[PDB]
Each structure stands twice: as C-alpha cells, then as structure tokens.
Design a binder for this molecule. Structure first.
Ligand SMILES: *[C@@H]1O[C@H](CO)[C@@H](O)[C@H](O)[C@H]1NC(C)=O
Ligand SMILES: *[C@@H]1O[C@H](CO)[C@@H](O)[C@H](O)[C@H]1NC(C)=O
Ligand SMILES: *[C@@H]1O[C@H](CO)[C@@H](O)[C@H](O)[C@H]1NC(C)=O
Ligand SMILES: *[C@@H]1O[C@H](CO)[C@@H](O)[C@H](O)[C@H]1NC(C)=O
Ligand SMILES: *[C@@H]1O[C@H](CO)[C@@H](O)[C@H](O)[C@H]1NC(C)=O
Ligand SMILES: *[C@@H]1O[C@H](CO)[C@@H](O)[C@H](O)[C@H]1NC(C)=O
Ligand SMILES: *[C@@H]1O[C@H](CO)[C@@H](O)[C@H](O)[C@H]1NC(C)=O
Ligand SMILES: *[C@@H]1O[C@H](CO)[C@@H](O)[C@H](O)[C@H]1NC(C)=O
Ligand SMILES: *[C@@H]1O[C@H](CO)[C@@H](O)[C@H](O)[C@H]1NC(C)=O
Ligand SMILES: *[C@@H]1O[C@H](CO)[C@@H](O)[C@H](O)[C@H]1NC(C)=O
Ligand SMILES: *[C@@H]1O[C@H](CO)[C@@H](O)[C@H](O)[C@H]1NC(C)=O
Ligand SMILES: *[C@@H]1O[C@H](CO)[C@@H](O)[C@H](O)[C@H]1NC(C)=O
Ligand SMILES: *[C@@H]1O[C@H](CO)[C@@H](O)[C@H](O)[C@H]1NC(C)=O
Ligand SMILES: *[C@@H]1O[C@H](CO)[C@@H](O)[C@H](O)[C@H]1NC(C)=O
Ligand SMILES: *[C@@H]1O[C@H](CO)[C@@H](O)[C@H](O)[C@H]1NC(C)=O
Ligand SMILES: *[C@@H]1O[C@H](CO)[C@@H](O)[C@H](O)[C@H]1NC(C)=O
Ligand SMILES: *[C@@H]1O[C@H](CO)[C@@H](O)[C@H](O)[C@H]1NC(C)=O
Ligand SMILES: *[C@@H]1O[C@H](CO)[C@@H](O)[C@H](O)[C@H]1NC(C)=O
Ligand SMILES: *[C@@H]1O[C@H](CO)[C@@H](O)[C@H](O)[C@H]1NC(C)=O
Ligand SMILES: *[C@@H]1O[C@H](CO)[C@@H](O)[C@H](O)[C@H]1NC(C)=O
Ligand SMILES: *[C@@H]1O[C@H](CO)[C@@H](O)[C@H](O)[C@H]1NC(C)=O
Ligand SMILES: *[C@@H]1O[C@H](CO)[C@@H](O)[C@H](O)[C@H]1NC(C)=O
Ligand SMILES: *[C@@H]1O[C@H](CO)[C@@H](O)[C@H](O)[C@H]1NC(C)=O
Ligand SMILES: *[C@@H]1O[C@H](CO)[C@@H](O)[C@H](O)[C@H]1NC(C)=O
Ligand SMILES: *[C@@H]1O[C@H](CO)[C@@H](O)[C@H](O)[C@H]1NC(C)=O
Ligand SMILES: *[C@@H]1O[C@H](CO)[C@@H](O)[C@H](O)[C@H]1NC(C)=O
Ligand SMILES: *[C@@H]1O[C@H](CO)[C@@H](O)[C@H](O)[C@H]1NC(C)=O
Ligand SMILES: *[C@@H]1O[C@H](CO)[C@@H](O)[C@H](O)[C@H]1NC(C)=O
Ligand SMILES: *[C@@H]1O[C@H](CO)[C@@H](O)[C@H](O)[C@H]1NC(C)=O
Ligand SMILES: *[C@@H]1O[C@H](CO)[C@@H](O)[C@H](O)[C@H]1NC(C)=O
Lengths: 313, 164, 164, 313, 164, 313
C-alpha cells in the first residue's frame, strides 16, 4: 500500500518577498498597503467642518462669508484650496502658529466681554468687507478710531477669574499713508502694547503702502495672547488698534486642520487623509503622509505582500 | 515531497493514498488547522492594529521658509524612510517565517506518520510512505485519525520488507 | 514528547528511565549547559547595556508656544513610538527564538540518543526510546555519558526487535 | 528497558509573547521594563545640585535666597516645582535658550572684571530684593543710574585675551512710568547696544506698567552674549542698563537640568529620572521620558517579558 | 559531523569516501550552488542598495545657538543611534540566518543521502554513512549524481547489516 | 564502504556576531561598513564648485576675489575652511537660512533689471573691496548715496511677469557714526521697507561703531525676499540702502553645500563626504555623517561583518 503526504497547490499563486529571495510564489497573500482612498471624506465618527471657502483664520476673525462658523466645534477642520478671504486684507506674523493653536483647540466658542473702550469711536468699517450689502468688518474685531478728533490712550485691565485660559485675538492697523493715519486716529503715529504678568508684546504700526490687494494699499496685522487664570490682560494703546471684542476658549484636545479638496459624504470611517477616508485595516498606506485619526503608517513601498498561504507548486 | 496537489481543497495539508480498493485523498484537519491558527494569529497582531494621532507637524509646504522648514521636512522624511525600512523588514521576516512555518508543519505531519507506522513503512524521496502491510482503507483512516496500531501489522509487514 | 517533568530539578534537559533495578531520573548537564549559555549570552547582549545621554530637548511643556513646540513634541513622540516598536519586535523575536532554541536542544538530545543507540532502539511517539537490550543502570549511565557502544548489544537486541 | 527524554516543568510558569502567539507559558521570564523608581535621587556618582527654591536663572543672576550657589558646579541641576524668585521681577526673551546654555556649561563659575562704569552711579538697589534685611539686588548685575543728574553714554571695550569663551549676562530696565525713567536715568528715553565682531544686539527699553508682581509694575529683561577669544566686547548704553559685573565661563560638557520634586538621598546610581534614580540593568523603562545618564530607553509598553526558560508543561 | 575538510576546494559541501579502490573526495555542486545562491541573494538585497539624499539639516556646528540647535542635534543623534541599532540587528539576524542556512543545507545533503541509500546504510555520529554493500567508485558517483538505486543492493547489503 | 559528508574549512576564518553569540568563526565575511574615504572629492558625475576661498554668500554678493563664480551652477558647492571674505564686512541675520536657500537653488544665475534708482547717486565704493587695484564694491549690490546733498525717498515697483520666482538680495548700511551717515546719505536717520503682496520686511539702520574689522567700524546687513509670479516687488527707502541690481533665479532642486578641505581630483563617484568621495557599495559607513548623493547610512559601529561563508572548523 502507498500513503503520500503533501500540500495543496493553486493554479495561480502570487509573489512575495522573503529574506533569502525576492520572488517566491505563494497561494494567497494579503496586501498590507492600502493604496486607494474612498475619494470622499466620511462624516462620522469624527465631527468635520467643511470650510467652504473659509481658512480657519478667516473663520476665527469673522469674515463676511464665514459667519456660519460662529461658535463651531470640530475634531477636524478642513480647508479647501479654493478658499480666499473676502474682507479687509491681513498679515499674521507666525501665521502657522496661530493656525495650529486654534486648530488644536478645536473650537471657535467665543464669549463677549465688557471691554471699556471709552473716549474712542467703536465699530469702524470698510468697503472691503461687505455683509448684507453694507460696509462691515470682521465680526470678532473692533476697529477703534478717534472720537471728536481725539484718541486718548486706552488702558484696559481685564482679569481672568475663571478656571480656563482665555485667548485674545487683536491686531494692528497699518494705514497706507500719513493722511490715512491722521484721518482715522487723530495721531501722527501710534503704538500698541499688550501684556500679562508672564509676557509682553509690543508693536509699532508701519505706515506706507503695499501693493494693492482688492484695491487696498493698507493692511491689518494679527497678534494674539493667552491669559492664564489669575492673570490680568492689560491693553495700552495710543492708536492703530484693532481691539478684541471678547475671548476664545482654549481647550486641550484632539483636533486639527487638514487641507483637502475632497467632498464630504455620508460614511463612517476613522482614518482621514486629504484624498478622503481610508479603510484602516491594513497596517500601512501609501496614499499620503498627512493623516488624521487611527491611520495606517505611511510607507514609500507601493506594495507589501504578506503571505497567508504557503509556497506554491 | 516533489510537488503539490492541485485538487486538494478540503485543507492545506493532507494525504493521498493508493490501495486495492482504489485511489483517493483527504485533508488532515489538525495539521491544517494548526497552520491556519498560527497564520491568523500573526495577521491579527498586525492587521487592524493602528495608532491614533491627531495633531502633527506640517508635511506639505508651499513657500520658502528657511532652516525651520528644512528641519521639519528632514524629520518627516527620516520618519517615513525608517518606517518604510521597518515595513519591508517586517514583511520579509513574516514571509520567511510563514514559508518555513508551513514547511515545518508538513515535516511534522511526515514524522507523525513514520512514528505511527513504526517499522511498517519506508520513507520514499517523493514524500510518500511505502507501507508493507497490504492495508485497505481502514489503516489509512486509522493513520489519518492517529489510532494506527503498529503492533497489529509488524508481524506481517516485516516479512514483506526485510525478509522479502 | 507528551509532557514535562515537574520533579526534575538538577537541570533542564534530562533522562528518566525504567529498568529491572528501578525507576529514576537525572539531568543531562551538557544539554542543559548549552541551553543556558545561549540564553545567558542573549541576556548579556541586552541587559546591562545602556547608552549615556546628558542633554536633550525639553519633553515636558507647560505653556503654548506654537510650531516650535509642535515639532519638538513630534520628534520626541516619533522616537518613543519607534523605540517601542523596536522593543516589542525585539522581545517577540527573542522569545520566538528562545522557545525554538530550547526545543532544538531537546531534539538534538533525542537524536544524540538514537544515533548512539544504533538500531538498538525504537522511537516512540511519547518521546521515549524502547531499548531492545535488557540493560540495567550501567547502559543508561553510559548513554548519559556518551560512551554507549552499540556493538556490544546489537547481537542481542536485534533478535528481540525484528526476529521477536 | 525504557529511556525517556524530556524537559523540566514548573508548577506555575509565566506568560510571554512570541511572533506567532501572544500568550505562551514559559518557566521563568526576566521583565525588561523597569517600572518603579527608587523614589529619591541618588547623590553619586553624579554631582547634583538640589536647587532648593532656585531656578537655574535665579542662581545665575544671584537672587537673595540663592547666594549659596555662587561658583557651584554640577553634572545635574535640579529644579524644584516650588521654586519662586524673591527679587526684582524679570523677563528673559528666549528663556529656554539661556537656560539650556547655562545648564550644559555646568557651572556658575564667575569672575569679576575691571569694567569702567564711569560717570554713572553703580550699585542701584530695590526693596524687591532683601538680603540681610536691607534692600539689595541681584549679585551678578550692576544697576547703573545717573550720577549728579547725568547719565553720559557709556562705551566699554572689554577684550578677550584668554583661551576660553566668556559669557556675559546683562539686562535692560523697563521703568513703569516716564516719571521713573527720568528719576533713575536723567534721560527721557534710553537705548542699549551690545556688540562683538561676530554679532550685534540692540534693545529699546519699553516704558509702561505691567500688572504688578510683588507690588512692582516695572520689569528687567535679560540678554546675553558670548565673546570668543580674540574678540572684544563692546557695550554702548545711554540708559536703562543693568550692567554685567564680570563673566561666566562656558564649558562644553555633559551637564543638564531636570525638574523634580524628589528628595536627594544617600545612594549610588547612574540613571536619574524626575521620579528619582532608576536601576539601569533593564534595557527599557516606562517611568518617564526625561532621563539623565546611562538610562534604559523609554517605551510605552507596560511590560515586556523575555523568556529565560522554555515552554512549560 | 565532527569537523570540516581543510582540503576541499571545489565546493562548500561535499563527499569524501573510502572504498577498495582508494580514498578521495569531491564537491556536491548542487548543494554548494544552492547555498551560494541564497547567500548572494541576501547580499544583493543589501549591498549596492543606497538611497540618494541631497539637502539636509546641518550636522556640524561651531557656535552656540540655543534651543534650535539642541533640537537639530537631537534629531540627528536620534537618527544615527536608531540606524546603528537597525544595522546591528540586521547583521546579527543575517549572520544567525547564514549559519543556520548553511547547516540546514548540510542536513539536507545528509538526508538526501540516507533517503537515497534506503536501508543500505547506517548513520554514524561522525556525519558518515556506513554502507553495507561493498561498492567501489561507481555507487559513490551514482549517489553524488542522484542515480543510486537501492533496489540493486538491498539484497546483498541487508544480510551484511542485520543478518551479520 | 564509507561515505562521509561535510563542509569545507579554512586555515584562518574571521569573526562575526549572531544573535546567540558575539564571536563565531566564519570562512569569509564581507565588511559592511566603509571606513576609508578616497581622500579627495571626485569630479563626476556631480558638478562641483571648489569654492577656493569663496563662502557661498561671498560668491552670491560678488566679493572681489569670487568674480569667477558669476552665473555658475552646481550640484554641490564646497566651502573651504580657509575661506575668508575680502570686501566690506557684513552681517546676515539668519545667515543659515539664506545660505540654505541659495545652496539648494544650485545656481547664481543672475539677471540685471532696469531699476529706476533716480535722484540718488549709484555705484558707491569702498577701499574695503579692491578689484583691479581700485576701490570697488560687491558686484551684485548697488550702494546708493545722496546726489547733490539730496536723498529723496525711493519707490521702485518692479513686477514679476515671468513664470519663475525672483530672489532679491539687498541690504542695509550701518554707518559707524552720525558723521558718516550724514556724509553719505544727507539724512540724520534712514529707514528701509521692502514689500510684496504676501509679506513685508522693514529695517531700522543702527548707527554706531562695532569693533573694527579690516579697520572698518561700520557694517552692512543682508536681507532677502522672494517675489512670486504675479506679484510686485516694492522698495521704499529714505537712506542706508544697498540696492539690488537684479535678481537671482530660484530653482527647486537637488543641490547643496558641504564644508571640506579635501582637494578635487579626476574621478567618478556618486557619494561625497567632507573627507572626499566614498565608494557606495557597502550599506553603511562610519566616515562622517555629512553626506551628499547615493550614500551608505552612517552608523556608530566601527565594524559589521556579514558572514558570506559558514561556521569554520
Ligand atoms: C486569502 O487569505 C485571506 C485571509 O487573510 C482570506 O480571507 C481570503 O479569502 C483568502 N483568499 C483565498 C484565495 O482563499
Ligand atoms: C492596491 O491594493 C489592492 C489590494 O487591496 C490591489 O488590488 C491593487 O492592485 C493595489 N494597487 C496598486 C497599483 O498598488
Ligand atoms: C465659495 O466661493 C464661490 C465663488 O464665489 C461661491 O460660488 C460659492 O458659493 C462659495 N461657497 C460658499 C457657500 O461659501
Ligand atoms: C469704564 O466704564 C464705565 C461705564 O460707563 C465708565 O463710567 C468709566 O468712565 C470707564 N472707565 C474708564 C476706563 O475711564
Ligand atoms: C458696536 O456694535 C456692537 C454690535 O456688536 C454694539 O454692541 C456696540 O455697542 C456698538 N458700539 C457703538 C459705539 O455703537
Ligand atoms: C467736540 O469738540 C469740541 C471742541 O473741543 C467741543 O467743544 C465739544 O464739546 C466736543 N464734543 C461734542 C459734544 O461734540
Ligand atoms: C515711502 O513710504 C513713506 C511712508 O511714510 C511715504 O511717506 C513716502 O512717500 C514713500 N516714498 C515715496 C516717495 O513714494
Ligand atoms: C509708491 O508707488 C505706488 C505705485 O502706485 C504708490 O501706490 C505709492 O503711494 C507710492 N508710495 C509709497 C507709499 O510707497
Ligand atoms: C493623494 O494625494 C496626493 C497629493 O494630492 C497625490 O500626490 C496622490 O497621488 C494621491 N494619492 C491617491 C492614492 O490618490
Ligand atoms: C479512525 O478511522 C477508522 C476507520 O474509519 C474508525 O474505525 C476508527 O473508529 C477511527 N478512530 C477514531 C477514534 O477516530
Ligand atoms: C559512564 O558511566 C558508567 C557507569 O557509571 C561508567 O562505568 C563509565 O566509566 C562512565 N564513562 C565515562 C567516561 O563517563
Ligand atoms: C530566572 O532567570 C534568572 C536569569 O535571568 C535567574 O537569575 C532567576 O533566579 C530565575 N528564576 C528562577 C525561577 O529560577
Ligand atoms: C514592574 O516590574 C517588576 C519586575 O522587575 C514587576 O514585579 C512588577 O509587577 C512590575 N510592575 C508593573 C505593574 O508593571
Ligand atoms: C524654600 O522656600 C520655603 C518657603 O519660604 C522656605 O520655608 C524654605 O526654607 C526655602 N528653602 C530654602 C532653604 O531656600
Ligand atoms: C577708565 O578708568 C580709569 C581709572 O580711573 C579712568 O581714569 C578713566 O576715566 C576711565 N576711562 C573712561 C572710560 O573714560
Ligand atoms: C559697588 O559695590 C561693589 C561690591 O560688589 C563694590 O566693589 C563697588 O566698588 C561698588 N561701587 C560703588 C560705586 O560704590
Ligand atoms: C554736580 O552738579 C553741579 C551743577 O552742575 C556742579 O556744580 C557740581 O560740580 C557737580 N558735582 C558735584 C561735585 O556735586
Ligand atoms: C499707556 O502707557 C504709557 C507709557 O508711556 C502711559 O504714558 C500711558 O499713560 C498709558 N495709558 C494710560 C492712559 O494709562
Ligand atoms: C493702567 O491701569 C493700571 C491699573 O492699576 C495702572 O497701574 C497703570 O498705571 C495705568 N497705565 C498704564 C501705564 O498702563
Ligand atoms: C513618573 O512621573 C510622572 C510625572 O510626574 C508620572 O506621570 C508617572 O506616573 C511617574 N511614574 C512612576 C513610575 O512613578
Ligand atoms: C552517475 O555517475 C556514474 C559513474 O560515473 C555514471 O555511470 C552515471 O551515468 C552518472 N549518472 C548521471 C546521469 O549523472
Ligand atoms: C568572500 O566572499 C566574497 C563575496 O562577498 C567574494 O567575492 C570573495 O572573493 C570571498 N573571499 C574569499 C576568501 O573567497
Ligand atoms: C575598514 O574596512 C576594510 C574592509 O573594506 C578593512 O580592511 C579595514 O581593516 C577596516 N578598517 C577599520 C579599522 O575599520
Ligand atoms: C586663497 O587665498 C590665499 C591667501 O591669499 C591665496 O594665496 C590663494 O591664491 C587664494 N585662492 C584663490 C585662487 O582664490
Ligand atoms: C523712471 O525712469 C525714467 C527714465 O529716465 C525717468 O524718466 C523717470 O523719472 C523715472 N521715474 C521715477 C521713479 O521718477
Ligand atoms: C553704475 O555702474 C554700472 C556698471 O555695473 C553702470 O551700468 C551704471 O549705469 C552705473 N551708474 C552710474 C550712476 O554711473
Ligand atoms: C545742486 O544744488 C544746487 C543748490 O540747490 C542747485 O542750484 C543745483 O541746480 C543742483 N544741481 C546741480 C546741477 O549741481
Ligand atoms: C554710543 O553710540 C552712539 C551712536 O550714535 C554714539 O553717538 C556715542 O558716542 C557712543 N558712546 C560713546 C560715548 O562712545
Ligand atoms: C567707543 O570706543 C571705541 C574704541 O576705539 C571707538 O571706536 C568708538 O568710536 C567709541 N564709540 C562708539 C560709537 O561706540
Ligand atoms: C572624517 O572627518 C571627520 C571630521 O573632519 C573626522 O573626525 C574623521 O576622523 C574623518 N574620518 C576619516 C575616515 O578620515
């Protein structure tokens, strides 16, 4: 009698790498690299803001076309490549840091404060920002100008008696010409100093024109400061101040910003990549390096096949 | 073992036999399941296991910034290059292990068989056992089901092996 | 080999025997020491080997700084995550190796024994050798001490194995 | 006769991971992750400063309660979380860099120099810094004020003819009001420029109050510069200068700062972690990520067991 | 196998024999070539495979800069230390594999021989086969060239092995 | 008959590491660490500039002794440790970033532009820069001074209508004394602002002497800006301006700077290290950590031997 032992074989196996050879035939192999995204961003489990035309900073400041973002929360904020501002032009020194801070907080929750802007004219507007067909301005900023040809120095002491950090966003105006600065502030030159117990910022306005953008030669710079519980925010300004109207809350968190032109669909998926959501079962991916959530690691290999079978034939 | 069996579909490892009743085959489901469990285990340790990150450095840049960017890019490239290394090494080790694993299980099956057929069989270089007792079906299933008793057949098998 | 010996304490690998004098056991100290040396070697390559660092980046932060901190944190997290990977892989490889190592040494002991008992013994599936010469103590120690002479007993063992 | 081969087994083994399985029983396994610190910092082989209430910067400047740190050396400086300054308040731009530099030098060795502060009044003091029950100031700084209502511009050329780098610590005073600046310097505004052949720093004093700290609305900023052998330190100042009294040596080195509330005991151990010393035989630890000396690597795994035995039963 | 052959230069693995014609040796070129191909393969996967980089962070510094430099140095040291780890681990795994590889090929050669000499030979503990047919040269080459027919000699070899 | 199987052995093998032992004898082992450089830099396949005495910045600005570098291209620029400038002394804030940018562009290709420096005197020179035995200046800079004791504010709008980025290098003069500033610019103080639509830079000249270098107490600072297609470079200056004469092109690329005292020979090699070229067959090297091209990775191990043979004897 004869008894033969052996393995199954398949008509067509696949090729995998080992340490001694690069090309060994195997019955079945599980690709470990998710190439192929869905093509759209899934809308759950994460909370995602679409950011139709709204850079997280335009939403922060309150651009005329980003008024639908007031007090929103997100786990992920998405910026579209087509976004553009449609308001008075601005310049944020260290833009990247402000953007990161707001992004990780994950919220634009804002509360108004009883600031004592007295002896000045509040709510200054510009044709640059049209809302409701009228000249307006960023909704979270208060552009102060002279009142009766007088701009007295301001001195605002706004204490933090709460248990959370307060983020104040404020700016500095840079009029195109001497003519404009005197027209608006009744000063020949201004100066702004903002301080806390821990640190101090100071800015000297820079008068002069820049190439016109949206026909405007002038610009506003954006600065920010964080006030810890127990501290006091002190604002001293002789002019060119774009005042805060209140503060934003800062949360520690799990939120961030991704740049993506992908649409947001009706889907549940944990891993988000600029090229939409990616199923996260495979350990590696080669779709992108920018990811959010419980994602596969990015590798440069186009393929990795892990044998699940055995050597064929 | 010279080649595989294209027609064996009820398991990965198995037996084929020739006797006076006929020719046929069946899988060894304990050998197959052991191979499957180790493979699925290895897959479970890897597939479906990801880490969650939320906020990271910028990886894509559109403007010239200077040395701060050179470092931020350097750091990311180092990470990717190094994880790509780990990924290739890991797969190559896992595949080297998987093929050695399945061959190991096959050798275990072969030894189980020669140890069960104590002195009633000869190892052929083609991966088959020559059995010196003229068995029909029942021995074959007994061997497959680990109940073969070598003490039943040695008295008849030895004289057809060494005494001719 | 079906199971281990809870009562063997003079080594890791060894022999147990049954003869007409009685039953008993002893360790094989060459097999045991070889296993011990490889294991201790592997431990010496790892344990007690650390690298000295003195000044590093900040890892703990209390204030919001912006992108410089995001990178400094990113770099440290990358390092930790990656070393955690290396640590798990290393231990899993070392443990896979250690268990295969000890089983390998056991198989070597088994082969040493069947090669020394040339044709005077049969391999049983329980990890025991059936010896066909009715030996009492001295053969057993001779086998343990690598001095067994198969040419002494084959004349009496073969006729109690194949000739019945 | 029967001869059986086999392995020893133990009544109770332990569980280790392999590559094919997560849970295999093994006779004995050596934990490779040092969890558990001693709970105290060992005082040898490394030289450790305790830093009772002394931030490395307060020790550097010479705070009234850090006078015991003059000319000390360390391999490791430890800061306590309870440390607070007890002297005139200060603001160090890029605090982190100064702190790192001094920390790695590993020494506060200081030598006085024959600076020619002439035509000004030296040794200015404040009630902020009380030593010996009298108003004093930081011991390594010289606060210059006017002399006979005159503050002539200073111009100090202090050459480096030695074979080592000299570190100069100096600062800038920011008086609360115009009243205070004129009182102290007999100038309406000051300016400080400090230079070497390789670089130049310049600071404009910022007059104005900040929230009061220790009842003081005013602050001092700290700046530093390094003079290489062959160079000349040039100090030009019309006012608001907190002058150096000499220089600190810089050594390349193996020293650093750790933040820790652990006590320092009587013990010998090479690896120091904020949570005290850690035995360094195991290759990995999960106590902290902040370490000093020949330490185990930090991993996130709580346990790693390396079999030393064999599969049990 | 007790020791190696200092005089074997036509391959890595081979045979040495003693018969009535004389003593001599020759390499087994299939065993040798298989060992060579796997080794050269492993070398080809590593040697000659480098990655191209053009612009990187500064690694050498001459002046004190502060925290930016501490990080730039930290990042580079982390990379080097970690690649040094990968390099040592890789070589140790490759060398452990290479020595196990070559020993595996030797065991395969040994089994090929005992499987070809079915029951016409005994395994000696010195790595040699005792052949029970008094063969001269032609069997030896036949074994070397995988054409040995055990059915030719069993009738004469068994009676000089078990029947004495 | 007897048939013995076995392995070859060699009279003298080598020692390699494995995972179970550190010292196992092996027939032959391939060293995987290229220790030993050639000792010279190979001149192909890469294009290499020698940089005889020319720091990439001196070549950029047009130092009297770097006039042979006009419009050169490189894959690798090499700086010699002996290089020194031989022209008016300068200070580049963030030197490292400018150096990196120019280095990666890989070119000094420069084109002149029709700048409208009108109402001022162009081509100002100094004894600091001698070329052709006459006082000169950096060849890519235009030092403007007053014309007929008048220095009118300048306002240059130079648009980018091309498809590539334009890099403008310009600087700021810091005269030693008030005497020199008034002599040269007919102003008591100057100010420079340079802007694009995306950003703005502004510099205030700092009058005062620094230690003399090459007998000169005064210095020039170097600044740069990038103009994207569609933008406009706007230069507004009342004085102390070292004007651009045109722009440099920026290319994305594969170029860089290495510091090396090695000579450049006649050789073909892909991997370049400060200590010359290194054969790139071995996967690791321990020559240096600074490399360019398709190089082995740097490791701290002095040796790694990969067995190619088998266990000996
Ligand atoms: C391949 O193996 C996977 C397990 O990873 C299994 O789910 C799949 O069905 C297999 N494919 C074949 C050809 O059986
Ligand atoms: C991506 O992976 C899938 C398997 O999940 C495979 O079918 C496909 O061919 C791969 N695509 C490429 C080109 O990598
Ligand atoms: C975004 O901008 C485009 C162009 O004006 C406009 O058509 C579109 O409605 C905008 N999306 C929204 C809803 O903001
Ligand atoms: C603050 O607010 C009250 C409310 O009208 C006003 O009386 C007072 O003038 C303000 N204080 C200041 C800043 O002068
Ligand atoms: C400015 O407008 C805001 C609406 O946000 C209003 O509450 C505030 O009182 C206005 N101030 C003046 C001076 O009208
Ligand atoms: C505005 O200024 C004029 C001139 O000083 C003054 O008389 C008047 O009271 C001020 N305020 C009003 C009520 O317009
Ligand atoms: C340069 O900018 C200043 C800003 O105050 C302006 O006064 C001057 O007219 C500008 N230069 C010219 C002549 O355009
Ligand atoms: C310079 O020229 C531009 C061109 O339109 C003009 O807008 C600007 O007023 C001039 N002066 C300044 C302030 O730069
Ligand atoms: C993902 O996006 C990047 C950048 O847009 C692109 O280069 C890449 O091809 C995309 N990958 C896939 C899988 O679509
Ligand atoms: C093994 O197979 C034989 C034949 O089918 C059967 O008689 C015997 O009971 C089986 N043994 C077991 C317990 O599986
Ligand atoms: C082996 O053991 C036997 C019995 O104890 C003894 O007679 C013999 O000398 C031993 N051989 C050696 C050399 O260990
Ligand atoms: C476990 O092994 C270690 C060696 O790492 C040894 O020192 C220890 O005593 C062993 N424990 C037991 C149970 O023997
Ligand atoms: C820490 O390691 C020790 C062994 O050194 C072990 O006894 C202890 O249980 C471990 N603690 C934890 C909870 O990790
Ligand atoms: C640290 O400060 C506390 C609170 O004043 C004081 O009790 C303690 O003595 C100080 N430690 C020293 C010795 O500086
Ligand atoms: C420097 O010191 C000497 C010593 O009194 C003094 O004569 C001279 O006035 C000082 N020089 C300066 C800086 O005027
Ligand atoms: C200031 O006090 C110091 C003591 O450190 C003394 O040496 C120095 O001469 C004093 N200067 C004056 C003006 O008294
Ligand atoms: C102080 O100033 C007065 C007024 O200029 C002057 O007469 C006197 O000599 C100065 N110095 C002294 C000695 O007080
Ligand atoms: C703001 O600060 C300046 C500092 O010079 C001060 O003069 C002014 O009084 C402050 N503002 C007010 C009115 O408090
Ligand atoms: C502003 O108000 C605070 C409140 O006490 C006061 O200390 C300060 O003098 C005022 N002015 C300045 C200088 O900011
Ligand atoms: C070590 O210290 C950190 C931070 O204080 C703490 O989170 C951790 O639990 C401590 N670990 C141990 C082992 O005590
Ligand atoms: C094997 O060797 C023998 C003796 O040289 C020779 O007769 C036989 O043809 C060879 N067989 C083959 C096909 O290599
Ligand atoms: C060692 O092996 C290499 C292959 O890497 C080979 O080229 C070289 O000649 C060998 N040396 C010896 C001793 O044969
Ligand atoms: C460098 O490597 C070569 C082999 O390529 C070797 O001969 C030489 O001894 C090594 N030098 C050192 C000391 O590392
Ligand atoms: C570099 O400088 C040295 C010293 O002046 C000079 O001898 C040499 O010719 C210079 N090299 C060139 C050609 O620039
Ligand atoms: C620009 O150049 C032309 C050419 O001479 C000249 O007529 C004109 O005055 C210049 N424009 C300016 C900047 O005034
Ligand atoms: C300055 O010299 C340059 C040569 O590069 C010349 O083209 C330019 O017209 C000169 N300008 C004057 C004012 O002579
Ligand atoms: C130089 O300045 C003088 C005095 O204003 C003036 O008369 C003359 O026309 C100017 N230019 C020339 C041609 O020198
Ligand atoms: C300090 O620098 C200024 C620069 O304007 C100079 O005027 C002053 O004379 C210098 N100080 C002295 C007295 O050297
Ligand atoms: C300060 O002293 C130096 C020493 O020569 C001198 O060059 C300089 O003019 C003086 N003043 C300044 C401007 O710092
Ligand atoms: C390479 O250069 C570095 C720095 O100059 C030096 O430390 C190292 O010894 C050199 N290595 C070799 C192999 O020459």
């Amino acid at each position: 009698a004869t008894l033969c032992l052996g393995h199954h074989a398949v008509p067509n196996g696949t090729i995998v790498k080992t340490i001694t050879n690069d090309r060994i035939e195997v019955t079945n192999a599980t690709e470990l690299v998710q190439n192929s995204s869905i093509g759209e961003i899934c809308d759950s489990p994460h909370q995602i803001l679409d950011g139709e035309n709204c850079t997280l900073i335009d939403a922060l400041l309150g651009d005329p076309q980003c008024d639908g973002f007031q007090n929103k929360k997100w786990d992920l904020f998405v910026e579209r490549s087509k976004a553009y501002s449609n308001c008075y032009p601005y310049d944020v020194p260290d833009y990247a840091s402000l953007r990161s801070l707001v992004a990780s907080s994950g919220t634009l929750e804002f509360k108004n404060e009883s600031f004592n802007w007295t002896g000045v004219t509040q709510n200054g507007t510009s044709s640059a920002c049209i809302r409701g067909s009228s000249s307006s301005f960023f909704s979270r900023l208060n552009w102060l100008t002279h009142l009766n040809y007088t701009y007295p120095a301001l001195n605002v002491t706004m204490p933090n008696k709460e248990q959370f950090d307060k983020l104040y966003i404020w700016g500095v105006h840079h009029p195109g010409t001497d003519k404009d600065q005197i027209f608006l502030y009744a000063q020949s030159s201004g100066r702004i100093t903002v301080s806390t117990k821990r640190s101090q910022q100071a800015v000297i306005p820079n008068i002069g024109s820049r190439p016109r953008i949206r026909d405007i030669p002038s610009r506003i710079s954006i600065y920010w400061t964080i006030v810890k519980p127990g501290d006091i925010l002190l604002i001293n300004s002789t002019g060119n101040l774009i005042a805060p109207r209140g503060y934003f809350k800062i949360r520690s968190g799990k939120s961030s910003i991704m740049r993506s032109d992908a649409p947001i669909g009706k889907c549940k998926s944990e891993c988000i990549t600029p090229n939409g959501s990616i199923p996260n079962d495979k350990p590696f991916q080669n779709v992108n390096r920018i990811t959010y959530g419980a994602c596969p690691r990015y590798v440069k290999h186009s393929t990795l096949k892990l044998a699940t079978g055995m050597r064929n034939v | 073992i010279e080649n595989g069996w294209e027609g064996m579909v009820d398991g990965w490892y198995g037996f084929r036999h020739q006797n006076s009743e006929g020719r046929g085959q069946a899988a060894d489901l304990k050998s197959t399941q052991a191979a499957i469990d180790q493979i699925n285990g290895k897959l479970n340790r890897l597939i479906g296991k990801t880490n969650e990150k939320f906020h990271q450095i910028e990886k894509e840049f559109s403007e010239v910034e200077g040395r701060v960017q050179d470092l931020e890019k350097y750091v990311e490239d180092t990470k990717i290059d190094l994880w790509s290394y780990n990924a290739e090494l890991l797969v190559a080790l896992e595949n080297q292990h998987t093929i050695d694993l399945t061959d190991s299980e096959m050798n275990k099956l072969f030894e189980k068989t020669k140890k069960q057929l104590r002195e009633n069989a000869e190892d052929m270089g083609n991966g088959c056992f020559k059995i010196y007792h003229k068995c029909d079906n029942a021995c074959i299933e007994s061997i497959r089901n680990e109940t073969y008793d070598h003490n039943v057949y040695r008295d008849e098998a030895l004289n057809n092996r060494f005494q001719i």
